[PDB]
Curated annotation (Swiss-Prot), chain B:
The keyword Transmembrane applies. Residues 1-70, 114-118, 196-201, 268-278, 349-367, 426-431, 491-662 are cytoplasmic. Highly expressed in the kidney (at protein level). Throughout the endolymphatic duct and sac, in distinct areas of the utricle and saccule, and in the external sulcus region within the cochlea. Expressed in the parotid gland. The lineage of its organism: Eukaryota, Metazoa, Chordata, Craniata, Vertebrata. Interacts with IQGAP1. This interaction enhances the chloride-bicarbonate exchange activity of SLC26A4. Keywords: Cell membrane, Chloride, Membrane, Transmembrane, Transmembrane helix, Transport. It is a multi-pass membrane protein. This is Pendrin. The chain crosses the membrane at residues 71-91, 93-113, 119-139, 175-195, 202-222, 247-267, 279-299, 328-348, 368-388, 405-425, 432-452, 470-490. PROSITE patterns: SLC26A (PS01130), STAS (PS50801). GO terms for biological process: animal organ morphogenesis; regulation of pH; regulation of protein localization.
Length: 665, 662
């Protein structure tokens, strides 16, 4: 239809006179905290069901086919998880048994406190890399070597194989306990807005840099070289240079086997991902490649005849729980916070993906509490921080998963592979386990293809991705996240400090105002210059507003007044002996403002007063109600600056100006 | 007065089909790189005029209240400048001989280059310890340590003199020159937007603990409490408790001397403010309490008969310029960057605290090159850094003062005090001049009265003011402004992340849409609701924008879809076996106050439209003027079905569209 209205010009005061405002509710802090404290059984049952979601999906089971679905998904997920754990155990500088330990206890702890259905809690390459890095920084290799072995010239300060692994495991357990404590603190205090700052490009660049560092570390492990655990600034570049300079001390057989298994696994994964319509169940290439590697490595003495690198350090048993060594929290609090926040970000991402894929809800604070409790329980049993891997979660989702019971069954596989099974994997080469990690890096390596897409989009979003990826390589990986979040906040501040001001004008015989820099056939009021200023004025962008006003009016309220004062004294001396031509009004269309930052309202009142001396009226067009209520308390409506200066709509100001010009020449 | 705005409802595609756009100018730098100043002499004369801020106020001052006012004010800050030069020089582990030069030469080059009044360039308390820190690190205390002097048992390892202090001044001279050239090279690329981040409560909360820092630094000299040097964290607390712990060895004669002078100097100060209409010219009590103190000290010998503490070490005569060591600039370069940044912060912070009481707003780019060449001019003469003390700028502004010429005449007082008035201020008790800074310090101590004022105006800046005040006490003045600057920017990103979202509603028989939580007797369209976020949808408020919708519509778009298919699968199996939705039709997001969008926002906003589309509830939008509209279509917001027809120019056009549709 059509749009036509008829109403008087209610600028600021003609609207608030016949409009009874809504009185705010009484605070009553005592009764507020008293009423908020729930005591009925309904709220108690609700918070119990929320805190322990296990009692929710259990009574409504569909055992009939869910039993078989969960048992097959559980055996598949258990195989995949024990393989990923025995692969990532090298990234934590701990023996291979602790990876399987951390692949068993966190699942049992999440089964009774989790709220998702497809999230496979377990090891993660990025988290394991960060744990290994902080362990090497806190416990280097050259800090445990013992002189023994009757050396030739000096004391035989060989490796400390033995008690060194116990110290590393205790350090990892303390780190996991601190991470769990930090996560529980973030969850219980309802502080969950801190993880909102991890933007999608930021986390993408961080995952890309972490995958690059994981590739570097796995190539170091495959080549079987001896580095000096370079950590700190340019650690990845320095260790890559050291690898390139230490090529001579490699293993040709291990390198050939690693390249072969890498090619095979990549080809099989690509074939399964591309031709999915012909094979419904993904072929567990990891399982078969591990089986064939253990079979080939057992036939011949690859440890003696080829000098390969195997584990051969599997005790095949459990251990009583050990209390963590408290006292190292002050020097690892930042690392624990970084690990916790990156793990929570990755977990929330995976959960949202697999939830919008299956159309169910996942709570954030509940997942935070669940991961915190899981890490706390793992810290008491010599385990590292657990997360959800994209590759491990994809297998459980492809095999068919409904509830966390498949995860409970997934622990049974690791369970039987810890107590009795496991010693058969003795001659397995470490390069084989170090290869599947590289093969799983294809997902995060293809994330670089977004920069050509993001560059065509908003350019500031692409700068954050490149900055996060590059900075997380120079000053390590842990400090790179802190340098990325601050950079993202600074980029946000830059977008609100430099707004997009225009020359808003009116279309002929209309009421809507559009910009003049993007249109040609627009009419402007005679003398009146309209200006719109988004990105509300604060202490940092007030000079920007001054410059924008000076540019849109053509002159300066200071220089014109100084010239007027200089010409005024010339008149008083001549009688004793014997610029602002086109500008008529200035309508500020501050309709996109949210806050005011009274430090800036001072300069706004200063501008209004300065333009009054040069007889140039400066009005307002579309100020919000809350903004005006805030400016009223900030001391802006004095005896001269009344409410008639403000307006409700942009057209009302122009209409009032036209009426005043017609009625007063 | 009524007005006829009869016009059919216009959407985006219905408004761009009859109008025309404008070709945006790319403005490539391959041919437009010489458009700033090629041959026009007007632009050349402009940059020279701004480069020399001497042709602006000097040919413009009025001599009515200029001659007598600035002279009596110059000697006031000139006397204080002499004490700071004689005090801060000892703390820098260098001989106390060049303190007077740092207040004479840098003022001359700043008198012509630099437009910032009420500032006395010279040494600063917290910057003198930083110089003494880097000197003792890269230079041992004993250079040669000649073991001679026929000691008790072994050779008397006497500390070498003459050559030791000469190298210390040479090292300090190279440091000031290295900071100067670094201070000047920053002005090349014109980084002057950093001063815009220093808010009035930021500099107000900063120049209130520094007034407390300069209070405790002047309290240990007025009480003669030998305390150790402390810097970094808890510097003010450790020095405060040391005075109270070492209060025993306090000069009783010097205590009653300073206590009697601090009262009489502040009493006459407020008396001049009360009788300012009677006596036109303010009485310079600073020069009065100075000459009477030398009389009671020289006529009674307060040093050798009362042990009160005097200067008694005033040098005489200038020194020729000495060339620095270029081969040592590489070592000080790693440490001068930290000192150069904190110097410029304190230098401009004392200019903004006085910019609120007088309309003298300055620019950071001009002050960066002004103080830059001043420290360069400070070089080659073995001077100190060209900072500005907080005590000298207070005694000049509170006790009169019109322009920067008060610093020029102050150097003249220092000029005659070194060549002809050296023996004059010899018995100065170092108390009447170390406590006179406390009298003029009330101008900054009374600045804490804005806490109840700012709290009633806006809660955010009130927290910023008290935060920077308490943080500068613990983390010191060095990291205090740095931590407060990040906290000030944090309040900007928080206010833009959690806006004041409210549901809007029209007024009867009109098209004005205002908030319903602040007004009454409003009405809402049956089945159509209005939501105004009034904030940009960036990566931080992505879920906050979702929580704003589900809390306003009553339901949650996520839980109504899974329960819909749950009931759908429930009734489906019953057919083979045998047999809370709000009536709101659509919602119009009044997201007109958005200023920018990101890739996370355009993706999340697309998911919201697709989410409500599956629930048979449409979602419409509001005015996206120039940027937030073109950015969405560039990020791939319209793929197959979502079109620009769902948008609207005005909020009322959205209501009229849903009205005639049903």
């Amino acid at each position: 239809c059509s749009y036509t209205v008829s109403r008087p010009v209610y600028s600021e005061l003609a609207f608030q006179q016949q409009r009874e405002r809504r009185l705010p509710e009484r605070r009553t802090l005592r009764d507020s905290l008293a009423r908020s404290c729930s005591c009925s059984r309904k709220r108690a049952f609700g918070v119990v069901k929320t805190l322990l979601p296990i009692l929710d999906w259990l009574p409504k089971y569909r055992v009939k086919e869910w039993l078989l679905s969960d048992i097959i998904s559980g055996v598949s997920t258990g195989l995949v998880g024990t393989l990923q754990g025995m692969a990532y155990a090298l990234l934590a500088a701990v023996p291979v048994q602790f990876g399987l330990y951390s692949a068993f206890f966190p699942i049992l702890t999440y089964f009774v406190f989790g709220t998702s259905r497809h999230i496979s809690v377990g090891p993660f390459p990025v988290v394991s890399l960060m744990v290994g890095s902080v362990v090497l920084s806190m416990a280097p290799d050259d800090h445990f070597l013992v002189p023994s072995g009757n050396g030739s010239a000096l004391n035989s300060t060989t490796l400390d194989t033995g008690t060194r692994d116990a110290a590393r495991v205790l350090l990892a357990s303390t780190l996991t306990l601190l991470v769990g404590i930090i996560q529980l603190v973030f969850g219980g205090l309802q502080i969950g807005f801190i993880v909102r700052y991890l933007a999608d490009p930021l986390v993408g660049g961080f995952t890309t840099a972490a995958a690059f560092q994981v590739l570097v570390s796995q190539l170091k492990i495959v080549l079987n070289v001896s580095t000096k655990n370079y950590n700190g600034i340019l650690s990845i570049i320095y260790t890559l240079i050291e690898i390139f300079q230490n090529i001579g001390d490699t293993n040709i057989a291990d390198f050939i086997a690693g390249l072969l298994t890498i090619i095979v696994c990549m080809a099989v994964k690509e074939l399964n991902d591309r031709f999915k319509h012909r094979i419904p169940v993904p072929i567990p290439i990891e399982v078969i490649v591990t089986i064939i590697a253990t079979a080939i490595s057992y036939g011949a003495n690859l440890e003696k005849n080829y000098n390969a690198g195997i584990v051969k350090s599997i005790p095949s048993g459990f251990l009583p729980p050990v209390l963590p060594s408290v006292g190292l929290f002050s020097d690892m609090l930042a690392a624990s916070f970084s690990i916790a926040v990156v793990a929570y970000a990755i977990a929330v991402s995976v959960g949202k993906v697999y939830a919008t894929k299956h159309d169910y809800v996942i709570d954030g604070n509940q997942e935070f509490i669940a991961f915190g409790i899981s890490n706390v329980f793992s810290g008491f049993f010599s385990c590292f921080v657990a997360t959800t891997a994209l590759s491990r979660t994809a297998v459980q989702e492809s095999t068919g998963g409904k509830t966390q019971v498949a995860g409970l069954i997934s622990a049974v596989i690791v369970m039987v592979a810890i107590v009795a099974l496991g010693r058969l994997l003795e001659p397995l080469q470490k390069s084989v386990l170090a290869a599947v990690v590289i093969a799983n890096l294809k997902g995060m390596f293809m994330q670089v293809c977004d920069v050509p897409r993001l560059w065509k989009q908003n350019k500031t979003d692409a700068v954050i991705w490149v900055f996060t990826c590059i900075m997380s390589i120079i000053l390590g990986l842990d400090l790179g996240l802190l340098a990325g979040l601050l950079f993202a906040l600074l980029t946000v501040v830059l977008r609100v400090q430099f707004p997009s001001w225009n020359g808003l004008g009116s279309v002929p015989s209309t009421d809507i105002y559009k910009s003049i820099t993007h249109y040609k056939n627009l009419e402007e009021p005679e003398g009146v210059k309209i200006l719109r200023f988004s990105s509300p004025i604060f202490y940092g962008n007030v000079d920007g507003f001054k410059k924008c006003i000076n540019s849109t009016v053509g002159f300066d309220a200071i220089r014109v007044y100084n010239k007027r004062l200089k010409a005024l004294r010339r008149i008083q001396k001549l009688i004793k002996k014997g610029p602002k031509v086109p500008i008529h009004s200035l309508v500020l269309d501050c309709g996109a403002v949210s806050f005011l930052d009274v430090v800036g309202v001072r300069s706004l009142r200063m501008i209004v007063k300065e333009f009054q001396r040069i007889d140039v009226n400066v009005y307002f067009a579309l100020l919000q109600d809350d903004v005006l209520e805030k400016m009223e308390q900030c001391g802006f409506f004095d005896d001269n600056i009344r409410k008639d200066r403000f307006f409700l709509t942009v057209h009302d100001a122009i209409l009032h100006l036209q009426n005043q010009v017609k009625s007063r020449e």
